[PDB]
Design a protein around this ligand. Structure first.
Ligand code: CUA
Ligand code: CUA
Ligand SMILES: [Ca+2]
Ligand SMILES: [Cl-]
Ligand SMILES: [Cl-]
Ligand code: NA
Ligand code: NA
Ligand SMILES: [Zn+2]
Lengths: 586, 570
């Protein structure tokens, strides 16, 4: 299998890496493991202006005030259990958000703050019939309402919630109150069932208290029952949020219609659906096991045809110390990270099932040493029924001496492993910044990108509407619109010239500069920087972008095109002249 | 033969550090060479969610008032030198967007100082004194502006409209002096003695040469002015009625010249012709006669002007006598022999061109290993090309820069790797592995957080041991140690509206056990490495219980390393 991508050769897969604590999404080529693009999401990006432009801040809403995010879980939308290449979704634990990225323009186009929750961590997509819902875990128990009167996690109104976001509208669909808390989550291959691990069944805040129970659980959601209750209006609302809220807690030992609690040891973490649709597989973490939940036994479980919730477990292989996460080659094998043993263990799922029934069989096929302390891992197309068993990435936390020293901070070691055969083979150590934690791969033919924006693209449609109120045709106009103490500059740009090369304002004026790149050639990006005003953005071919700033300094102030666009790139400059406040009314 | 191993397999280490400009994104990146893998990101002019740079009090103190800016535009990274060789102390980098120079300490891989250059706009070209050491950082301000720039005069041809050449004291990161010039400044470099520096310039254009010794003598005697509210000594290096300054000479060079590169034997300032398909070679050994008025014509210091190809932009050196120049239009790197060019300029029939290698596509800068030092080793070359076209998978409307690694160890250049990079790094610098010595554990006395140690002292806090909440009006100062997997303060209570500062000291002593600190839904994030103190300030404007958690994976029980901030309603 081709391991190295030479000058002139192209990668075979796209890889979408979480940006970890840094807050972006990164596009890599696989197997070269080189970063091809950065997609700003929860970070403020100086290069493109994401977080500074009006278009990006409009998408971020009120959360545009935050300069940080904490990503972990990137996933690609699906149709009939295969990637369809339309959207990527990612979580923000730091400020409780979910973001959607459009894979044709490789930009975040929608973002939502999940109401009435703290810390959006685990995130996974419905597989079948398509990604109608984005499922997202809120990790931490909070009071409801969280108004400062009650702080006790054991109060009857202190809880966290499972969250479902409409993937296409990026509005909330519903929320399910659960017992305990939520860690990771996955979905079945029918649309009926989703599942989440819980590590805090104790609802504690101290470390010992969170580890008290021998078993926490994976909570299983009957989404069909949830949708039925919403359509019937059997729900409540919290605060000023109109999101339907359903109660999935046990009340005095009796189950709700919406949930079932399957005892699983211990502080389990990973929650992974096998590519054949047979199992929710939970990684035991503090327990040296994984637990295998038979999805075809869930209808019976929710119908009361089983006596004990444990009866849906058909395997609990002992695997090694600190199992965290599992992935699949599509050949019947599972691959699980062992954080403490520092390995990836390859095991046969159907043989583990037989061992649970008492048959002595060695389901463990191979243990590969990794370097070191692996968290999550990802096999190519593992979240689809097209799981191809070619590439595996294990994302290890402590890189130690695997790379040159670079001061007190260390990179994550994202190691590429060849799993096309019976023997796992380590082929590449990829260092990455701010702990990506997890990633997702797609074949080259599953991603189709645009090189030239459409003029009606929704990403800047609000800006087009603003332009229209000023009577502006953005494709042609080079005009300075004045409006009180607001100035709206509209210009085309075509390398190597700004359509407006100078304009004059009053000190204190609020200046909006809107640029429409009317070059129609691939890869002629322009930039726009106003010197010493903290203003910077990118404008790709046929895009409109805009940015607003206060002309708070009198005098002449240069602006320039930041992105190398033309042999005369260095002459693509202009001047803003700011008349001093003392020559104007006060 | 060019035969070097290009593959760094698992368990093997790179041979060089590469320091990449972060381009329009504003950071510095540390790469391993020859793998071309990114080992680390160093935040500088960007705000980094991961480490908290731009949010923490320590970082905002370094940035000063410019902490209000969330952007930067980097191009020119360079490493400090002693006796013409890299000494591993500091990296310096420019910010064209908000007119800054930043210093990175290579032992901790953090920006530790930053200056806004006064009375200029757009710090672009930047390079370091070589000899006897990097006393000065030299920085070009690109754009001509009025002086003062108070909105009375906007005319760029006015007598008081100009730009200036800037010298920053490398060790103090305070301004040393500024020299007014004629024209706009592009790129700059320094000689191997400390007397001379030079910059490409325009409005045939020129390479202006600076007699730094003469500038220093005038500062010592007090023959300077100051501008506005900056105490920086300002010297006038302009021509006046055809009469030369004592500080400058203008050497005519065609045409809109761009790169300005000192050969590693110290013989030449080489200016890349750009619009002229040439480079111009200025003989540094003739500059003293030039300034002494002993030459008849400024063009007499030009000892070579080889024709190389269309659009020469930048030049580097293998230490074997060859120069390598990017041809932007022809889209190549051309290898040529400098002494043969000098003889050709005299009329000898000698072909100084050795090889042209196609690169992909439109190269700007290039960099050979140790090229800025008299130890230039002729092993690796990186050419940084702007239009990557079909060399990588398509990724939407934006495109990566193509930073191509070329083996120059033998007679023939060989292209070995295409490295895609984000936001047009533009230029880079390499150092031998043994030229860089980094700390894995912080020193408790490090100046990076010494202002925070000082704050702790006024509160009576021993940062190494204490877990205490200090109340001070509507200000709350939490101090805590952290040791995986537990925050030393796991809960604290404040009043809605309080201004909370959380100072965390990581007292783990094992390498690479970093902790984080994130306050959910408050925009608060930072990293604390072993034996570091880091602090962050935010207002508790929302009543109720608000979780904080450790963001950096520190322990098997990392997920459980959490705490609770309780906010009582107003
Ligand atoms: Cu437009 Cu460079
Ligand atoms: Cu401390 Cu994770
Ligand atoms: Ca537990
Ligand atoms: Cl998972
Ligand atoms: Cl240069
Ligand atoms: Na939204
Ligand atoms: Na400073
Ligand atoms: Zn440059």
């Amino acid at each position: 299998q081709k391991i190295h991508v030479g000058p002139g050769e192209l990668d075979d897969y796209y890889g979408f890496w979480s940006g970890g604590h840094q807050g972006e999404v990164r596009v890599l080529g696989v197997p070269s493991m080189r970063e091809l693009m950065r997609i700003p999401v929860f970070n403020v990006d100086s290069a493109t202006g994401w977080g500074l432009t009006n278009e990006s801040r409009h998408i971020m809403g009120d959360s545009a005030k935050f300069l940080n995010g904490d990503c972990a879980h990137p996933h690609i939308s699906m149709t009939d259990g295969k990637y369809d290449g339309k959207y990527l979704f990612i979580n923000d634990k730091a400020n409780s958000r979910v973001a959607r990225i459009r894979l044709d323009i490789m930009k975040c186009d929608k973002m939502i703050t999940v109401p009435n929750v703290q810390a959006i961590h685990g995130l996974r997509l419905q597989k079948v019939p398509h990604t109608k819902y984005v499922f997202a875990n809120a990790e931490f128990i909070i009071p409801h309402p969280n108004d400062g009167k009650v702080f006790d996690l054991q109060d009857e109104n202190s809880y966290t919630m499972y969250n479902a976001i409409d993937a296409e509208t990026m509005e909330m669909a519903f929320q399910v109150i659960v017992d305990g808390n939520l860690d990771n989550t996955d979905a079945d291959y029918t649309g009926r069932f989703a599942a989440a691990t819980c590590y805090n069944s104790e609802k504690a805040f101290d470390l010992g208290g969170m580890m008290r129970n021998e078993r926490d659980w994976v909570v299983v959601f009957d989404i069909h029952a949830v949708e039925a209750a919403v359509k019937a209006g059997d729900f409540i609302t919290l605060g000023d949020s109109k999101t339907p809220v359903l109660d999935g807690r046990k009340k005095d030992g009796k189950d709700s219609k919406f949930t079932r609690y399957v005892p699983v040891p211990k502080n389990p973490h990973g929650c992974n659906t096998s590519s054949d649709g047979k199992y929710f597989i939970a990684a035991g973490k503090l327990s040296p096991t994984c637990s295998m939940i038979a999805i075809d036994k869930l209808p019976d479980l929710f119908a009361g045809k089983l006596a004990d919730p444990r009866d849906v477990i058909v395997g609990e292989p002992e695997l090694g110390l600190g199992p965290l996460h599992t992935t699949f080659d599509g050949r019947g094998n599972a691959y699980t990270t062992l954080f403490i043993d520092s390995q990836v263990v390859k095991w046969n799922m159907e043989e583990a099932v037989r061992a649970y029934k008492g048959e002595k069989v060695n389901y463990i096929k191979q243990k590969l040493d990794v370097h070191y302390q692996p968290g999550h891992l990802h096999a190519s197309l593992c979240e689809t029924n097209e799981a191809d068993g070619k590439w595996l990435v294990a994302l290890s936390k402590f890189s130690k001496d695997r790379f040159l020293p670079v001061g007190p901070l260390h990179p994550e070691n994202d190691q590429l492993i060849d799993i096309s055969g019976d023997e796992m083979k380590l082929v590449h150590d990829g260092p990455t910044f701010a702990e990506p934690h997890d990633c997702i791969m797609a074949r080259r033919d599953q991603i189709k990108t645009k090189k030239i924006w459409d003029r009606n693209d929704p990403f800047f449609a609000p800006t087009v509407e603003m332009a229209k109120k000023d009577g502006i045709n953005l494709d042609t106009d080079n005009k300075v619109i004045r409006d009180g103490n607001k100035v709206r500059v509209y210009m085309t740009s075509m390398a190597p010239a700004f359509g407006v090369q100078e304009f004059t304002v009053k000190q204190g004026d609020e200046v909006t500069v809107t640029i429409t790149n009317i070059d129609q050639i691939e890869d002629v990006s322009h930039g726009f920087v106003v010197v010493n005003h903290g203003v910077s953005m990118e404008i790709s071919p046929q895009q409109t972008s805009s940015i607003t700033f206060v002309a708070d300094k009198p005098g002449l102030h240069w602006y320039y095109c930041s992105w190398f666009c033309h042999a005369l790139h260095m002459e693509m400059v202009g001047r803003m002249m700011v008349e001093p406040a003392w020559s104007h009314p006060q």
